[PDB]
Amino acid sequence: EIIQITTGSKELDKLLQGGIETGSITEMFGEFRTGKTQICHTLAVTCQLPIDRGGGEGKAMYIDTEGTFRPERLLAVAERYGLSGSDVLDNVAYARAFNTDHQTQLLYQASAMMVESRYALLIVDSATALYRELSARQMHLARFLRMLLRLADEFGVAVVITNAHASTTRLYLRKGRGETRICKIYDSPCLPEAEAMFAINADGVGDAKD
């Protein structure tokens, strides 16, 4: 059964039919500051929440390639949700991929870790940055993406990557005024296009306010 992890924003959660889905990949498009990395940091904490509070009751794994992982942000989100800051940090496993080979190798370690402890989320920010001969890189990336799908299938974790299989949800983020941001989703038998506004704060992703 699927678990939907809260993004911290009621509007964004509604757009996502509940939140970030375990068992599949959510691919977010946008540059740093559009909210993609902020969403990742928020999810690394909310995935630890009790299921009734919108969490996945599991640990988070964060593979960074940009050098933008910030433990202090996790502490702020933890305080916001009334969670132990120390426990939250101990429950987020982090690694920085040095190159594309390392990026893929980390998935083997990830799989071993998921056998030992319960994880609810795997973040890869960014899944493509290190890839930017050409055909060789494209095949390697394709393999990497299929491996992520296998992990989601095998362990039932939500896989969120920043930058497709039928189960992949693609989110296109853009800047709004000030701290507000907009997320847009496409081709949906329910609606051709749908959008939701959210905000990035010191303590994570929240709803946009006037």
Partner: peptide, 4 residues
């Protein structure tokens, strides 16, 4: 907030 900054919402218009």
């Amino acid at each position: 907030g900054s919402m218009g």
